[PDB]
Design a protein around this nucleic acid. Structure first.
Ligand SMILES: Nc1nc2c(c(=O)[nH]1)=NC(=O)N=2
Ligand SMILES: [Ca+2]
Length: 314
DNA sequence: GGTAGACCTGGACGC
DNA sequence: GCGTCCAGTCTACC
């Protein structure tokens, strides 16, 4: 009862609610869709993970978003802690207004958005986002998720233990820059990305001015931010866009991957026009990104998550 | 400036 | 069962 992962039903007195209609958020579509790789549905309809250096389990009813925190006597999430949840899911942004707009300007979006509502963008931590996506290239969500777990367990602070699951905070820059980190990461199966992780942690801390340099990009322009990130090892056009969209408040950033190319070709009959290549290339990928922005507007990155997410269901 | 491989890993085909 | 295919970044020519 007092042990293991909690459920709304099993530990009633231990959950606080946040008004949130499923029309504004569908956890089952946001948490396992490749935005963040640290949430697990440990029990049906309940998702557990680390949010703001604390462990949480979240579940939702038709109109409520139920939250519970494990921190020292077990209490309820305070309205302050709940605020941390509101910021993570950027609940101030009205998903219904964006959907309305996108659907208005894009008949196909309208058609798809009808079956996949509640897909919004999480506002992630720069460091976690950076290395998680460095791990994402030329890889599948299943592996990435495992890789990111082993990584946090090996270099991240130990938080708390539920059942046989020990949660860890995300590794720090200093830890990731440590000696023999790449070697360790390889035995952990990160493949060649093991080097990227080490090299980018080192480069940030020893050549760019550390954490402040990264956090500063949030106030910077999208074009500036994306440009800066490309500097780092293992960070190409897509990874950079993922970071700008999900961690740097650059809502118009559109990550162009294999998924978005398929969608573009199949659902909009798109073809590169200012480029000679007919397939993915640095030129055509940049163009496709412009195409979606021109299609959905300032929040192109968010609209993207809707179709991307719905494309995963296949 | 603009392209062909090379690079870890492992679930998913296909024969 | 074994050999592909598939889920981006980087680099060596052209
Ligand atoms: N275009 C995208 N590429 C992604 C992604 C996402 O939400 N959009 N998650 C991910 O791991 N790769
Ligand atoms: Ca590919």
């Amino acid at each position: 009862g007092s042990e293991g992962h909690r459920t709304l039903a099993s530990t009633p007195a231990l959950w606080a609610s946040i008004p949130c209609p499923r029309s504004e958020l569908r956890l089952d579509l946001v948490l396992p869709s490749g935005q963040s790789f640290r949430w697990r549905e440990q029990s049906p309809a309940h998702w557990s993970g680390v949010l703001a250096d604390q462990v949480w389990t979240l579940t939702q009813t038709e109109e409520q978003l139920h939250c519970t925190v494990y921190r020292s006597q077990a209490s309820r999430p305070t309205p302050d802690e709940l605020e941390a949840v509101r910021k993570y899911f950027q609940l101030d942004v009205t998903l219904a207004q964006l959907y309305h707009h996108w659907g208005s300007v894009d008949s196909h979006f309208q058609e798809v958005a009808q079956k996949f509502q509640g897909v919004r963008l999480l506002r992630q931590d720069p460091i976690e986002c950076l290395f998680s996506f460095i791990c994402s290239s030329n890889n599948n969500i299943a592996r990435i998720t495992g890789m990111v777990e082993r990584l946090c367990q090996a270099f991240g602070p130990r938080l708390i233990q539920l059942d046989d699951v020990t949660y860890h905070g995300f590794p720090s820059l200093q830890a990731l820059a440590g000696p023999e980190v790449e070697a360790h990461l390889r035995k952990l199966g990160l493949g060649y990305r093991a080097r990227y992780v080490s090299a980018s942690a080192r480069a940030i801390l020893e050549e760019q001015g550390g954490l402040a340099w990264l956090q500063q990009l949030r106030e910077s322009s999208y074009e500036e931010a994306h440009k800066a990130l490309c500097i780092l090892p293992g960070v190409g056009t897509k990874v950079a866009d993922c970071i700008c969209l999900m961690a740097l408040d650059k809502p118009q950033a559109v990550p162009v991957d294999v998924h978005m190319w398929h969608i573009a070709q199949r659902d909009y009959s798109w073809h590169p026009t200012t480029s000679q290549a007919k397939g993915p290339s640095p030129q055509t990928n940049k163009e496709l990104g412009n195409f979606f922005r021109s299609l959905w507007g300032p929040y192109a990155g968010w609209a993207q998550a809707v179709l991307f997410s719905a494309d995963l269901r296949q």
